[PDB]
Amino acid sequence: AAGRRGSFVEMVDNLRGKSGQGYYVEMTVGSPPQTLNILVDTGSSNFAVGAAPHPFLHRYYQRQLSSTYRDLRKGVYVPYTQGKWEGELGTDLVSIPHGPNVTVRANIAAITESDKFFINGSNWEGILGLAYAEIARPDDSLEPFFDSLVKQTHVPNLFSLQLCGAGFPLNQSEVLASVGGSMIIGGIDHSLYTGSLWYTPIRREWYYEVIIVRVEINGQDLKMDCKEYNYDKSIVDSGTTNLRLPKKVFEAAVKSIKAASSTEKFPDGFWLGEQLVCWQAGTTPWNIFPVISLYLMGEVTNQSFRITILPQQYLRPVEDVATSQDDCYKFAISQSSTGTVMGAVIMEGFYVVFDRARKRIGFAVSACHVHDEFRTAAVEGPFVTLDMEDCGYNI
Numbered sequence: 160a161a162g163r164r165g166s167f168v169e170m171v172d173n174l175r176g177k178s179g180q181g182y183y184v185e186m187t188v189g190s191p192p193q194t195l196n197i198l199v200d201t202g203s204s205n206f207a208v209g210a211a212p213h214p215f216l217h218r219y220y221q222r223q224l225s226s227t228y229r230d231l232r233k234g235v236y237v238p239y240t241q242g243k244w245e246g247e248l249g250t251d252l253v254s255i256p257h258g259p260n261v262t263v264r265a266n267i268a269a270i271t272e273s274d275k276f277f278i279n280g281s282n283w284e285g286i287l288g289l290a291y292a293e294i295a296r297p298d299d300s301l302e303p304f305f306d307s308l309v310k311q312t313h314v315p316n317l318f319s320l321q322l323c324g325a326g327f328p329l330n331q332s333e334v335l336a337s338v339g340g341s342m343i344i345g346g347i348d349h350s351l352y353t354g355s356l357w358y359t360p361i362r363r364e365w366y367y368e369v370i371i372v373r374v375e376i377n378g379q380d381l382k383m384d385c386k387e388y389n390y391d392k393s394i395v396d397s398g399t400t401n402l403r404l405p406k407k408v409f410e411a412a413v414k415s416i417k418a419a420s421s422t423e424k425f426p427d428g429f430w431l432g433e434q435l436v437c438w439q440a441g442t443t444p445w446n447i448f449p450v451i452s453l454y455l456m457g458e459v460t461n462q463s464f465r466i467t468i469l470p471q472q473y474l475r476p477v478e479d480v481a482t483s484q485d486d487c488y489k490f491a492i493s494q495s496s497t498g499t500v501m502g503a504v505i506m507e508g509f510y511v512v513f514d515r516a517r518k519r520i521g522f523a524v525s526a527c528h529v530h531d532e533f534r535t536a537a538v539e540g541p542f543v544t545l546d547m548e549d550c551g552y553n554i
């Protein structure tokens with residue numbers, strides 16, 4: 160054995176938030192610096208911040224107060240799966256208080272209009288799209304923030320995320336004081352995980368796309384053409400709460416998860432991820448829900464590894480409508496029409512390494528994943544898997 164050291168103490172515990180409202184990191188924009196909380200989103204590629212009054216914002220970017228502000232005289236429109244905003248392009252000096260000690264000039268979309276984007280009480284005023292330029296709006300010429308960071312400094316072309324779910328509800332006061340995790344910019348901090356790191360190839364550099372080759376519910380093979388699992392793509396997206404699955408995979412997964420938890424009957428609303436279910440304080444029957452394993456393409460030919468999540472991950476802690484002493488949750492898995500989305504739910508159980516430089520993504524058991532005395536999340540390998548390339552989808 161050999162104890163693993165944490166070498167980025169300055170960035171550890173720099174995140175706050177929760178799966179339901181997103182995780183954010185503190186940033187500064189302009190001269191003098193204007194402090195803002197920014198949603199960490201590996202699912203998009205635009206750096207944008209509120210730049211005008213809004214019901215849900217307590218503060219916003221004030222361009223006229225920044226001596227380093229540069230107007231790009233260009234409008235920008237960004238529509239997500241749900242939620243959208245319109246803004247004005249420009250550049251300015253940007254820093255990360257609890258990150259590498261550097262300042263860089265990056266593109267900034269000043270949000271002037273938005274619909275269903277900002278979330279009441281999230282405590283963040285902007286978003287940080289960490290994905291590639293290919294999906295940046297208006298187009299790939301608008302250099303993403305992390306690209307600017309790497310090109311302008313010596314920070315390694317790599318970042319890692321530790322999203323920490325509490326395992327229980329956090330009120331407004333609590334979510335503000337609580338540590339929500341870590342975003343290590345430029346490296347890997349060994350104190351954030353246990354066990355080994357397994358890497359899966361980044362299939363294509365647009366979203367952080369990966370390939371799932373096998374799915375199990377309590378060790379039982381979901382048994383579908385692996386191509387279904389990646390229809391029309393599979394991405395790692397911290398900007399989305401739930402594990403989202405292709406319609407057919409969702410139907411199969413839900414049927415299998417219900418069968419495994421059959422000793423307990425749950426209403427349709429529950430399975431639709433719409434309504435919560437509650438249990439007497441401390442009695443949540445974790446053991447009746449199955450673990451879910453996702454096999455990922457490995458880096459060696461014909462080799463794969465698997466990540467296993469517990470219901471402590473796919474069941475999201477929520478406060479009871481009557482703020483009682485029950486432990487309540489919602490089913491954090493839902494159907495997609497745009498492929499598989501490995502959201503915050505899934506990320507909370509693992510330390511995820513976005514190794515841009517080696518075009519790969521690493522997974523390791525999170526030092527902060529919620530579990531019980533009987534089961535734990537896992538990252539295991541290797542497995543002999545054939546024709547994995549066939550699992551990828553092509554239009």
Ligand SMILES: CCCN(CCC)C(=O)c1cc(C)cc(C(=O)N[C@@H](Cc2cc(F)cc(F)c2)[C@H](O)CNCc2cccc(OC)c2)c1
Nearest residue numbers: 179180181202203238239240241242243276398399400401
């Ligand atoms: C996160 C807190 C709760 N929310 C949002 C509020 C209900 C979700 O769980 C959620 C649910 C769905 C169902 C989509 C998105 C969604 O679109 N997330 C965005 C970011 C985001 C947007 C927003 F409005 C509010 C947020 F908090 C976070 C990702 O970038 C999507 N990546 C794929 C994609 C898909 C289409 C276009 C695209 O452009 C890059 C990227 C987010």
